[PDB]
Amino acid sequence: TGHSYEKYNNWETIEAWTKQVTSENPDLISRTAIGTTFLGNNIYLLKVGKPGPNKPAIFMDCGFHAREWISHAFCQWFVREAVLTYGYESHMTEFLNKLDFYVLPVLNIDGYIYTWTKNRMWRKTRSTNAGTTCIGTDPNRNFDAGWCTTGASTDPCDETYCGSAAESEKETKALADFIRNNLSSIKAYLTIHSYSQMILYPYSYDYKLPENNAELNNLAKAAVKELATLYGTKYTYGPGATTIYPAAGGSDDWAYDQGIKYSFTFELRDKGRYGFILPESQIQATCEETMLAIKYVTNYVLGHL
Numbered sequence: 001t002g003h004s005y006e007k008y009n010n011w012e013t014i015e016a017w018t019k020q021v022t023s024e025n026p027d028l029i030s031r032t033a034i035g036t037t038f039l040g041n042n043i044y045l046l047k048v049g050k051p052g053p054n055k056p057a058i059f060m061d062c063g064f065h066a067r068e069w070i071s072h073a074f075c076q077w078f079v080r081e082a083v084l085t086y087g088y089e090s091h092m093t094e095f096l097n098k099l100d101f102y103v104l105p106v107l108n109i110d111g112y113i114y115t116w117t118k119n120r121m122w123r124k125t126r127s128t129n130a131g132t133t134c135i136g137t138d139p140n141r142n143f144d145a146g147w148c149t150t151g152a153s154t155d156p157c158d159e160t161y162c163g164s165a166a167e168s169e170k171e172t173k174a175l176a177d178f179i180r181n182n183l184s185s186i187k188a189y190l191t192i193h194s195y196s197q198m199i200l201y202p203y204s205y206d207y208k209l210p211e212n213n214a215e216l217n218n219l220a221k222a223a224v225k226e227l228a229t230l231y232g233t234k235y236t237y238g239p240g241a242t243t244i245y246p247a248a249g250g251s252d253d254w255a256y257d258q259g260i261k262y263s264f265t266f267e268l269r270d271k272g273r274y275g276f277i278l279p280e281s282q283i284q285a286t287c288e289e290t291m292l293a294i295k296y297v298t299n300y301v302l303g304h305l
């Protein structure tokens with residue numbers, strides 16, 4: 001149960017960490033719970049930044065999908081960076097002074113626990129479905145964004161089950177509720193996944209392009225260029241539908257249609273050699289190169305308020 005930033009931490013460890021990282025950095029981090037999972041675990045959200053009046057924000061979550069462990073790991077890496085370098089690195093000091101970073105460590109907690117206890121390749125939530133023994137809904141097929149129209153299944157037994165309705169899951173409802181209650185401050189939405197090495201932007205539920213697809217393409221292009229500067233990691237980018245595959249009900253598409261103009265989905269390492277079982281030995285390298293990308297986007301948004 002001892003936390004490590006170069007190891008994958010189980011939920012009890014991550015929860016302890018949310019509490020300890022908050023208590024040690026009261027001037028930079030505040031922790032709240034935005035809801036509970038189907039199984040009663042607390043959905044924590046850390047608010048990172050120097051508190052001030054009416055601050056704009058960037059919202060980032062990890063752990064939508066249970067088996068994408070490098071995702072969870074990144075949210076934690078991000079937080080330590082914020083606090084070790086505030087006051088020393090000009091950009092991060094500038095980011096933290098100017099905006100508030102909403103970091104949601106793990107969205108799908110019940111599923112994360114399941115990958116640690118029974119099935120390592122579990123992806124969905126762990127809720128029950130009526131009329132079947134099959135368990136779970138794909139949280140990224142559960143948002144109101146052309147809900148269940150494409151790239152989603154209506155069968156609970158499938159890995160891409162879209163749910164009984166949009167926001168049927170307490171976790172997606174909770175996340176959606178928080179974003180809706182904070183539209184005014186939230187300027188960018190970032191949702192961390194794995195794997196494939198890509199940076200996607202709207203839309204995935206459709207082949208139609210967002211109004212600012214030109215900017216998002218340039219932004220994404222610059223961010224991947226940035227990421228590649230550390231270890232040469234090659235990422236592709238573009239609108240989801242055409243870049244990865246069409247898939248309805250994703251949070252990135254939903255957030256974008258809420259008014260949040262900078263909405264990106266990051267698909268971290270690797271390209272399929274280890275897939276979801278990305279070794280711990282790649283945690284720092286992955287997190288380090290990903291920081292550059294997130295920071296690039298952060299500077300851009302700040303400079304485009």
Ligand SMILES: N=C(N)NCCC[C@@H](CS)C(=O)O
Nearest residue numbers: 140193200204240247250265
């Ligand atoms: N498809 C959307 N809406 N956004 C990009 C996410 C693709 C993928 C992540 S594991 C998935 O959720 O299947």
Ligand SMILES: [Zn+2]
Nearest residue numbers: 065068193194
């Ligand atoms: Zn995913």
